[PDB]
Amino acid sequence: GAMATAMYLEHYLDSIENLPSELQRNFQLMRELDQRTEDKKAEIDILAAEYISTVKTLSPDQRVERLQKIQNAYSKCKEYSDDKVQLAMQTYEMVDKHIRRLDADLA
Amino acid sequence: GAMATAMYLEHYLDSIENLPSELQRNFQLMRELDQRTEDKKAEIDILAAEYISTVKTLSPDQRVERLQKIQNAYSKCKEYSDDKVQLAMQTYEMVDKHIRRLDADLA
Ligand code: NA
């Protein structure tokens, strides 16, 4: 059913500029949350790359410093990732609600 | 419009370094904007292809992840087409004002 997928997708995309109020909200919350996730990813990239290059210049405590510090950033990034997945599923019901009504009014 | 603008560029054919700064800026922005506009429309076609071809096997959370990217790109084209209209309007109204000084002077 690629026909219906496409048809519904199109009809949806012509409705973006006035979605339901709670749906815009959810998309905005997901955007802000995606930012927190993108930033923590770029942050982890540094701590990783920095640790790799400057690896030999480190004692046993200075190694256990960076790892236990990176563990904190990975754990934090995961909270965001897990939250997004929940906020996404919640939003999917709203999108399915909207497309059904949208396409009922177009029939 | 275009014809006026074509004749304006024909006047400076050799001496394009004489051509006003506000106008030389705008003529580039129009060319840059057209690339960014033409890229986003292509990106949307690919993203929509991915979505049509794999929606059946995608979980609700993943269906929303895809929909985020397509929405945002679709918003960006809408934005880039409003930008192109208003930039060409401003560029054309500038060219007209510059034509009135050169060719259509009141003396
Ligand atoms: Na006069």
Token output for B57: 């096997």
How remote is the CA of residue B106 from the centroid of ligand 1, in Å? 6
Q: What are phi and psi of A8, to 5 degrees?
A: -70, -45
Closest in A9, A16, A95 to B64, CB measured: A95
Half-sphere exposure in the Cβ direction for B52 (13 Å, CA): 16
CB within 8 Å: B68 and A30 = yes
CB within 8 Å: B51 and A9 = yes
CB within 8 Å: B71 and A9 = no
B residues 64-93 closer than 8 Å to A (CB): 64-65, 67-68, 70-71, 74-75, 78
Which technique was used to obtain these atomic coordinates?
X-ray
Q: What is the resolution of this structure in A?
A: 3.1
- CATH code: domain A1-107 is 6.10.140.1740
Checking A74-80 for CB contacts under 8 A at 24+ apart, the result is A74/A44, A76/A40, A77/A37, A77/A40, A77/A41, A77/A44, A80/A33, A80/A36, A80/A37, A80/A40
Which residues are CB-contacts of A37 (< 8 A; sequence separation ≥ 6)? A77, A80, A81, A84
